[PDB]
Structures are given as structure tokens and as C-alpha cells.
Amino acid sequence: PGGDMSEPVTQSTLRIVGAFWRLDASLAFRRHFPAINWNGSYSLFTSALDPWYRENVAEDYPELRDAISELLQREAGLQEIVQLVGPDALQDAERLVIEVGRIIREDFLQQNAYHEVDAYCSMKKAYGIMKMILAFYKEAEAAIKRGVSIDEILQLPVLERIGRARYVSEEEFPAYFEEAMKEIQGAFKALA
Amino acid sequence: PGGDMSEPVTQSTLRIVGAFWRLDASLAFRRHFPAINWNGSYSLFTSALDPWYRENVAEDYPELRDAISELLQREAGLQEIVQLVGPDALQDAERLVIEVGRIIREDFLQQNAYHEVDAYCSMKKAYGIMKMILAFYKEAEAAIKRGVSIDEILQLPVLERIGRARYVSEEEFPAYFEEAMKEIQGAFKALA
Amino acid sequence: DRTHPIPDLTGYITEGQIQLSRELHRKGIYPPIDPLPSLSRLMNNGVGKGKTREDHKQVSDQLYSAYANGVDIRKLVAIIGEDALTENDRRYLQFADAFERFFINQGQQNRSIEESLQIAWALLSMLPQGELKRISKDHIGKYYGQKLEEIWGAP
Amino acid sequence: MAVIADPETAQGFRLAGLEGYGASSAEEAQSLLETLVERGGYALVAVDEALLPDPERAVERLMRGRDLPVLLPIAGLKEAFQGHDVEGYMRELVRKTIGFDIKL
Amino acid sequence: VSPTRMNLLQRRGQLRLAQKGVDLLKKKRDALVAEFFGLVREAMEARKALDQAAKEAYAALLLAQAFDGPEVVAGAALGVPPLEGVEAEVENVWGSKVPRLKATFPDGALLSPVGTPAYTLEASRAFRRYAEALIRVANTETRLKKIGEEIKKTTRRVNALEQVV
Prior knowledge:
5 chains; A: mainly alpha; C: mainly alpha; 7 helices; 3% strand
């Protein structure tokens, strides 16, 4: 009642279930679904399911998931300073981390339940999306070490491809992923 | 629990007690003992005890106590500037106040409980130490008024005699006090 | 919440606590024990010269102070940039990062007290010789100077 | 570019290639500053310190919209031949910046 | 706001975040003051150098107008084209940007005027050195002003937080 998570039923449930998916009202207000509070959720089955992920999805899937979680944690940590001194007071690396967190939130975690294609997403599609995001982050930080302005990176056209990769059908994704990876490599390595 | 002073037991206790000696962990962290915070502590028995102090200690004891308290208050009032710009950026009077407060803290308030002779202090020894400190402060202010440098004052040898006062035996104290009082007036006037 | 009745009474009866940090756990560090809010009220009795080693307490408090300083500096480096820091600030930042990476994140290893002290001294060797204000010169002379080759001996 | 000082100093500044100007009171100095900033006074515009104690007083109108001009006080011909206490000027700057005296 | 346990926890978290931000801003102010002191020292040194250059330039001037006639030095002044062109490069000061001034240089003696007497020649060279010191003084003054502005902003922010929020 009232969204109070200290209500005794919620506390009783919290001590029994192995996974917890807490929802957020602020995300629902922004119409950002599934509106799952990343900070307030957890899961206790991650370690036991690693061999299955290695065998059936990809050999380095846990590493990518850990990298994504670490990036989200760092972005959440930097948000405390962002809400204090504003986004423009940060350095280039912190701004890059914030932008990568925004990209992850808007293009990977988000999902349209009423879309004919985005409603269902297999494990391999998500693996490809997160691999693309990680590769882009690595290239962007490498370029940042080379003195390239952060504003130049944010206008790179591959961001639109990454954002639209979510709507690609399960059949066209295997070639779309290769083309997007080649484009990401070209936009930085060939340009430099 | 938690050290909050708004807890009802503390509020009820502070309305009927006559004294409050606020022990502080910060003072003990910097190896200052017996670590009673003089900013938070207070007492309500001074007015009733003043005639006894006049009768059994000295006629001027309340004046010396008030002078010491006022010097400590003034030293505590300058803590912002000495923290922002550092001690060396102050004037001569401010540096003199800071050093007098430091001498007070290190030679009068501080006490070693495990020391053989410093464990217990009578009223006479405390009165003598306070009088010596006040006399040295007056002489230092006069020297500052006569254009003497603060560094020269901070290197006088009578400061060692003042510092070792609290380690002097109770029966042998009066001779030490007389010699130190003579040296305090000798060190400033003779050097000119 | 540390003001909840259960942890409040438990801390009001017991003699300290060990605090687990969600940030360390999310950063892939195990066991995610946070030294800054952790506390033991009987440690001074359990260490000394006839037990553990004579440098235990000084090393522990120096590590606490250095880690606190490095963590505090890591917050300011976000806004003021790395180049605006002095050399000591950069040394503290690197020490804090290496401390979190090697000391706390031990995985499933079974480190004896001597191994933990050796790792602590290796981490402290990153700091300048005169920066170890909380340790007597004898222990510094006896143990300072070791390089980081300990955690790599147990992957 | 242009320096406003006594006419004797203005001759030297014209000798140096700078657009020196002669002035002896605040009114014509302010008029020259206004006509320089209106016509596009480029960057540095030196003004004799004994003439205008603070040149920015005439720049407050235009300081908001532009950042190119840089104005600093300086001694004139006769003023520089006598001792100049720039340390008091620095003390005043520090006192305005922080709010406390910093040196003794 | 609605009084509930979750709201109370959120408010306590906000209070802790505000305290941490206050301490961080205090550290930033300390660092800015530390830089400000060195800027003040270098500005004092630059001002002293500029004063010395101005005095020697005026000394070189006093010979020009005395031994050579006023018309000679006037023609020498009129002969040289006026110096124009100041490069206002940007300089980063803790995020803030300050203009750094350096002017074009016509090589000096290559642009010599009809004013041949040596007493006139020395004054122009001394004036160019004086202006070279002047531009450095202007640069250090601008940097000091930017540092002071940042210090004022940080102090106002710290006071506003710790006295209002």
C-alpha cells in the first residue's frame, strides 16, 4: 500500500525469494518500461548459471555481464556528483561514463512490450548488443586518451545504429551485428 | 546508541545535573588526554564556589580562570581562517593567539594519568601554571607591540620551563614557579 | 538501515561489527568487506609481540588512514581532474586502487596472517618512505621495500 | 593598441606604434574609452592609474556583452618616475578576492 | 511530502549526500586557494618586472625628446605604422576559459622610421620590451581573476548548501 517497500508482506517475501525485481515509480512516470529499479534489485542465481551461459550462449558472456554491471555501478556513483555540480563540471572520462550509462539504459535495458519485434529478445541478441556497446566504449575511451573532444564522439553516426539494433528481427541480427561491429571499428581506427 | 544527544534519557539527565564533562573521541584520536571537549562542556557550580576559591586558593583565581577561558574561546574562534589559508598567513596578534592556545592545550589541559607526579594536580599548581601562562602572554603581546618578531618570541627558552612545570613535584613546585616567574620577566626586558 | 532495532541492539550488545558493502560486491570484489565502517573493540588485546607480530596494530591503522585518504581523493579527482593533483594525491589514488584490487579481493584463497602482513607491507611500499607517519621507524626499516609479487603467487 | 595617459606619455606610445592618447581628467578618459570600445578597441587598452583608479567602471556597461578588452592600470610618465607601491594594489586585490588580509 | 518510512530513508540518504557534497566542495575550495597563492606570487613578480621595464623605458624616452627635437621624434613616431593584431588564445582555468594575449611583432628595427638618431631608436626598443612585460602581466592578472571568481563561486555554493538545504 502506497508503494512503501517496508510493508511486512514485502519484507517477508524479500527473505525467501532467490531473485528480486523491484519496480520504480519515477521510471514509470517517464514511460520508460519495463521500469525496473536497477539499484534496488538483485539475484542469487548468477553464479550457478555461469556454466550454462558459457556452454550455450558464448564463452565470455559472464565477463561482458560483469563489465556492464561495473559500468552501471560507476555511472550510479558519478550521478551523486552530477546532481550536485551539474554534468558539465565533470571531466571527459566521467562524461563518457555518463553517456555510456545513458546509452545502456535507453538502448539495452529498455524494451517495448507492444512491439512486434522488440517484445521477444533471445540471449544471443542481447549478447551482441552488449558486445557492441562495450566495443564502442573501449574505442571511445581510447579516442579520449588521444585528445578527441567528447562532443565529437556523441555525434558519431554509429550511435543511431546501436540504438536501432534493438528493433532488428531475430533473422537479420547475425549479419547486422557483423556490419555494426565493422562500422564501429571503422569509425575510430580508420578515422584516426 | 549512536551518540545522539536528542535521545530522551540524555535530555532528562541534562535538566537535573549540575555539570557535564563531554568526552570526545576526536581529541583522543590526536593523542590528547584526558580528552574532555572544552567547547561542549559546562558547569553551574562556579558562582557558588567563587568565595571558596578566593579564601583557599587566591584572591584573583576567578579572574585567571576567566582569562584562560576567554583566551581559549578566542583561539577557537579563529579556527576557520587557520584552516582555510594556514597559520603562516596570519598577522602577529593572530599567530600569538594561536601559539598561546597551543601552549595552553599542551601544558595545562593535557595530563598524563600514568605519570608518577603528573597524575594528580592540586589547586595551587594549576593557579601557578595559569598565572605563568598569562604573564608570558602579556610579555609576548608587549614585545609584539615593541616590534619584536613572532618567530623570535616562539624560540625563547623559558617556554621549556613552562612546559616542564606540570611534571614538577608538588612540594618542590613553589621554588620552580618563582624561578620561572623571574625568568619570564627577565627574558623579555633584558633582551629589549 | 543501521537504526533498525535488530542491528541497533546487536551492536549495543556485541563488541564491534563487520560491514559488507554493496558497491564492492557490484564491482566484482569478494569478499566485499568494507574496512572503513568495520570495527573491532577487542583487537588491541589480541595483537602484540608475543602473538601475531609486533607491527600488527601500526600497519592496520596506517592502512586504514591511507585507504580513507585515497578514497576521499578519488572523489575530488572526478571534478578537478588528474593533472591538478599533486604527486602524493596520485600515489594515494593508485594505492587505493591497488588495495581494493589485491587486498580485499582475495577470492577463495586462505591467506595466513604472515601472508596478509606481507601483502599489506607490499601495498604500503607504494607510498613514499616519509609518508608512513603512523609507523615507528624500526618496523619501516625492517619491512619496507617489498614489491607486489604476492597475489600472483595464488591466482 | 590604445593607451590613455598624459600627452607626454602619449608621444612615447605613438613612438612605440601604440595609439597613445592624452588625458588629464576622468571625463575625457571615459569618453575616449567609450569611443574606443564603440569603434572596436582591440584587447589591451592601458589607462594611467592616477587618471582612472579603476578603468572597469566605464566598462561595466560593455563588460557584460564582451570579453575581448583587457584593461589594467599603469603609471604615467611622471608617475612612474616616483616610487610605485604595487604591493598595496596586490593586497587590495587579495582582500577583494577572499575577504581577509593575507600578508604582514 | 508524504510521511512514510521509505520517504524517511530517502530523506536521510539525501542528507548524507548533501554532507558529502559539502565536504567535497570544501576540498575544492582549499585546492583553489592553494593555486591562488602561487598565482598571487607570480603576479607580484610580473608586476615588479613590468615596473622595472617601464622605468627603463621612460629613462630611454627622456634622452630622445631632449637631445633630439620634438619634430624629429614626432616624425619618427609617424613613420612607423601602428601595431595591430593581438592573438587572444583560450586558456583553461579549472573548466573556466580565460583569454591569453600575445601580439604580433613587426620585427622592430626592420620597420625603422625616418628618425635615425640613436636616442630615438633606444626608446622604441625599450617600449617594445615594456609591452612584452605588460602582456605577461595582463595574462597573469586574468588568470588570478579567474581563480578568484572560481573561489567566490565555490564559497557561495558551500555556504548556500550548509545554511539552507
